[PDB]
Each structure stands twice: as structure tokens, then as C-alpha cells.
Symmetry: C3
Subunit: 190 residues, 3 copies
């Protein structure tokens, strides 16, 4: 297996010294740099850069600068995804985002782990844990979502949360560590 | 009522599709972009841009880039307000800041709420809860202040706090959620 | 004593009105601005700016933009230090970082304190508490390290942590406030 293949298979992989992955990260970082220095009202150019970054034709994906990602192509996006300022989709592990998702400012979606043992860590190895963000979700500002976490459809994550564990659907969850506080009634309003 | 008027009255309003509000946000975002790409030692130009953004003649309001706000004109500022890097004054609900206020880096003042029910949320409706920041206050870095919160004059908010509830005056408060730990003696020193 | 000397001696000092310190901060802010607007693939120029900022010849110190520091020369760096996006080394108090250190995105290392009493605070006085970051450490994203804190060699700090107290070596620690959860076995792997 190549190191990319290991990364995508939840295996330890050489994130720091694999040339292919280094080059892919460089591609993404240079696009993010361009995007981050493009006037917010230059709508067409921003759309072009977003679509180049994610290697997809986005449908109402609104990205407020600055933005960061590692690969770009490993973020799978639905439609109507609103990302406020200073977010980071750290996507060595796939980040899948549904439709109608509101992401507050200063949110970090982190799929990367390093070994706890410093000898193995210092060698550059990482293991990526995919993040799944359900459709119909809302994240307050200052949230961190950790590797391997799934947030269920219809759920709301309070500002400042550190999401260490999966959040069931149709739930309001807050805190460090983030815990369900109540269910959300999402039935069709009258 | 116009949607602006609803916003300013603590009513649900169409944040996402109201043209007037969309244009006002665009005004602010373009000024912030200019400010964020102005050399920190270009003192005059930075002052001009700050005053244009907040639609006021500021008196020793120090803004370290980058900075973000939604409207700008809905942040009411006293004198001697020091704002370190990467703050966001999300001001659909008025943010009132007193005199002699020290705001640490990476602080978010969030007045926006969305409906919990995804059907209403997906429609773009928001409700804004004003934030009041007393004079003579200090915020550590990495603080999030939530909608409708008042921090009393003379109070100190520890780094990393998530301020979910009002903080009384002359109090030290820390944590997620942020809780008063002790009173502060602010009497005139000898 | 000059105000710089007071700062470096853990004494109250006039951070806001001392011309020497004001000018030193301006030097650093202008370099950070240049660095933050330099293409990530302009390797040589970025290295030059980093080395100018820290007033040292760095050895594999990787700084992802944007970055911020107050003085630059008061950050003492080992080799193989990886700093992801949006970090701030607030270094009025010396920040000493060992070798083989992985620092996640949106981390703040804060050495500055202000007086709690607003009368003394409003005068501009600060007191700096040095931060020591051991070799062979890993910080998740969204961590804040507070004044005077030491993180021991071989330790790992979980994402979102607010590190209020010293962390012993060879420990995993998480939370707000950050607390040791277990020891880390760092013995030489087979
Ligand atoms: C959680 C949230 C969505 C709604 O809160 P709510 O349902 O109205 O609940 P309340 O505010 O009445 O508080 C419920 C309890 O949870 C706590 N709580 C609420 N939000 C919290 C949060 N983000 N973090 C930690 N605790 C929180 C409250 O302190 C309270 O504790 P108590 O039971 O001891 O009194 C809101 O607090 C929030 O985080 N909003 C996001 C704001 C934001 O980020 N806006 C910008 C992007 S649009
Ligand atoms: C709260 C603060 C202002 C002063 O702390 P303090 O009054 O000296 O109190 P101590 O450090 O002795 O700790 C008091 C207790 O509260 C806790 N605590 C202190 N600051 C805390 C914080 N920010 N978050 C969570 N807990 C905190 C400590 O862990 C300790 O718990 P214990 O009773 O179990 O021992 C300081 O911790 C802080 O947050 N400083 C801001 C630093 C900063 O952001 N600087 C950059 C901008 S200038
Ligand atoms: C702490 C960490 C390093 C490893 O966690 P771990 O050893 O696998 O432990 P677990 O995930 O099994 O959880 C252990 C417990 O601590 C809690 N916990 C774990 N990480 C936590 C964190 N960062 N903050 C708060 N609580 C945390 C869990 O909720 C769990 O609580 P429980 O005992 O009630 O079940 C990981 O959670 C983390 O923070 N990773 C960093 C991710 C990151 O920032 N990546 C980007 C930069 S590379
Ligand atoms: Cl938002
Ligand atoms: Cl500050
Ligand atoms: Cl990292």
C-alpha cells in the first residue's frame, strides 16, 4: 500500500515524509492562501477557488475567510453548507458533511492523531479518523470535533464544545467534553 | 417591520435572504478584508478603516488583525478598548463595550442564535441576543461569550471560558461553563 | 531597571507605555504580517522571515500561517518544532520550546497577566509568567496554555485543553481545566 492508501484505510501512515502526501498538502495550502487573500465580494473567483480546493462543483457552500484544509479533496460536501471564519477541516481522514449544515466561526474538525509514544510520533506517523457531520446540523463557534467522531443528523453542538464522542441524531450537546443535554424536536412546524 | 428592525428588536428575522442585511454584511466584510491586509504600522489607514467599520470616531480602540464583525455599526465602543488578534464581534444583536476593556486573542462575542428545529433553521431565520461588556473588564484569550450575555463592570473572564450566563460586576469567572470563582477588590489602590 | 528588565524578571512592568517595548512589539508584528502574506510554498523567504522574527537560525521549525508573537526573540526554540495554523506565542515571559514538539492549530501560549484590580490594570501594567514546553510533546488543536505553566517532556495535551497548572512529564492531560488522565509509556519501541 502507498501511504495515501494507508491514510484512507485508518492505518498508521507516514504523513511527514511521504512525497505524494506532502505535494497534495502543498496544493491545498497554496489554494487556501489564494482564497484567503481574495476579496470577499469577488464571488466568481472565490467559487472557482473553493471548487478547485475541494475538487468538486459545490452547491451553495459558503466559506468565510480565512479557511484551512489539508487535502481538500477529502472533504465531501452536501449542499447549503455555511462555514464561518477561521475554520480548519483537517481531512487526512475523510470529513463528510451533509446538506444544510451551519458551522460557526473558529471550528476545528480534526481527523489526525499522532502516536502517544514519542519515539513513534517523532518518526512522523499519523493515523486518521474520519469525521461524519450529519445533514441538518448547527455548530456554534469555537467547537473542536475530534478524530473518528460522528455528529448525527438534526443535532446542535453548543459553542466551545470539545466533541470527543459521537453525538446521536436530533440532540443538543454542549461542553468540554461534549455531552447530550436534551433531544430536539425536529418535526415539521405548523 | 423590516428584517433589520426585527433583528434589533430580538425577533426572529431573515438573516440569510434579506437584501438590506446581506449588503450591510458585505460592507463590513470588505472593510475587514482591507483592514486585515493593512500593515500594522500604517496607523492612520488602520484608524480610518476602523472608524469606517464601526461608523464612529474611535478613541484609543486598538484592533489587532485579523478582525471580523458582521455589521460594524452595531458595535458600540467606549474609549481605551484593546482587542488582540483573531477576534469576532458577531453583532446582529448590539454589542456594547464600555471604557478600559482588555480583550484577549481569539475571543468570540456571539449574538446569533438559530432555531433548534432544522426546518425553521434551514429557512435562514435567526434571533439576535445583545451582549453587554462592562467598563473596566479583562478577557483572557480563547473566550466565547454567548447571545444575550452581560459581563458586569470590573470583572475578569479567564482564558478559555465559555460565558453562557451573565457575570456579576467585580467578579473573577472562569470555565466551561463560566462560573464566578471570587470577588475582585477594585478599591482605589494606595 | 528598565521595563524590559522588569518584564524578564517576573516583575510588574509598563507594557503599554514603554517605548522600547512598544517598538520591539512593532518589529515583531510587522514581520508576522509579512510572513502571513508570504505564499506557503515560498520556502526560502518564509525561513528568512521566521529566523528574523525569532532572531535565531531555526532547525526545522515549521510555522503555518497565520502566526503571531509579541517579541519573537523571547521564544527559545529547539529543533523539529511543528506549529500549525493560527497559533500565538505571547512571549513577554520567555516561551521555551524543546526538540520534537507538535503544536496543533489554534493554540495560544499566553505569558501575560494583568492586575485584577482595574485601577492598576488600566495603567498598563503587566506581569509575565514564562512558559516551558518540554521536548517530545504533542498539543492538540484549540489548546490555551496559561502564564507560568510548564508542560513536562514526553507529555500530550488533548485538544481544547485549558492548561492552568503544570503537567508532569510522560503524561496525557485533557480538559478545562487540564488534568492528567494517565501516564504515557515512552519506552523505546521494539
Ligand atoms: C446550547 C445553545 C445552542 C442553546 O442553549 P439553551 O438550549 O438555550 O440552554 P440554556 O442557555 O438555557 O442553558 C442550558 C444549560 O446548559 C449550559 N450551556 C448552554 N450552552 C452551553 C455551551 N455552549 N457550553 C456549555 N454549557 C452550555 C448552561 O450554562 C445551562 O446550565 P444549567 O443547567 O446549569 O443552567 C447555546 O448556549 C449556544 O451554545 N449557542 C451558540 C451560539 C453561537 O455560537 N453563535 C454563533 C454561531 S451562529
Ligand atoms: C483566572 C486567571 C485570570 C487568574 O487565575 P488565579 O486567580 O491566579 O487563580 P489560580 O491560577 O490560583 O487558580 C484558581 C483555580 O481556578 C482554576 N482556573 C484558573 N484560571 C482558569 C481558567 N482560565 N480556566 C479554568 N480554570 C481556571 C485553577 O485551575 C484553580 O483550580 P483549583 O481551585 O482546583 O486549584 C488566569 O488563570 C487566567 O485565565 N489568565 C488569563 C491569561 C491570558 O489569557 N492571557 C492573555 C491575554 S492578556
Ligand atoms: C486525548 C487524546 C489525545 C487521546 O484520547 P484517548 O487517550 O484516545 O482517550 P479516549 O478518547 O478513549 O477518551 C478518554 C476519556 O477522556 C475524554 N477525553 C479525551 N480527549 C479529550 C479532550 N481532548 N478533552 C476532553 N476530554 C477528553 C473522553 O471523553 C473520555 O472520557 P470518559 O472516561 O468519560 O469516557 C484525544 O482525545 C485528542 O485530544 N486528540 C487530539 C486531536 C487533535 O487535536 N488533532 C489535531 C492536531 S494533530
Ligand atoms: Cl455562524
Ligand atoms: Cl491581550
Ligand atoms: Cl497539527
Amino acid at each position: 500500500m502507498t501511504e495515501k492508501e494507508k491514510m484512507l484505510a485508518e492505518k498508521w501512515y507516514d504523513a511527514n515524509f511521504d512525497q505524494y502526501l506532502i505535494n497534495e498538502r502543498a496544493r491545498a495550502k497554496d489554494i487556501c492562501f489564494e482564497l484567503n487573500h481574495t476579496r470577499p465580494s469577488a464571488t466568481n473567483k472565490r467559487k472557482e477557488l473553493i471548487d478547485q480546493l475541494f475538487q468538486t462543483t459545490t452547491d451553495n457552500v459558503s466559506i468565510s475567510i480565512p479557511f484551512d484544509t489539508d487535502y481538500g479533496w477529502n472533504v465531501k460536501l452536501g449542499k447549503n453548507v455555511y462555514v464561518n471564519t477561521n475554520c480548519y477541516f483537517m481531512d487526512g481522514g475523510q470529513i463528510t458533511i451533509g446538506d444544510n449544515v451551519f458551522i460557526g466561526p473558529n471550528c476545528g474538525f480534526y481527523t489526525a492523531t499522532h502516536p502517544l509514544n514519542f519515539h513513534h510520533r517523532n518518526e512522523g506517523f499519523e493515523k486518521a479518523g474520519p469525521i461524519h457531520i450529519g445533514s441538518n446540523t448547527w455548530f456554534g463557534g469555537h467547537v473542536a470535533v475530534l478524530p473518528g467522531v460522528t455528529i448525527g443528523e438534526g443535532s446542535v453542538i453548543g459553542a466551545g464544545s470539545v466533541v470527543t464522542k459521537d453525538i446521536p441524531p436530533h440532540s443538543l450537546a454542549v461542553g468540554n467534553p461534549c455531552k447530550v443535554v436534551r433531544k430536539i424536536d425536529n418535526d415539521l412546524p405548523s
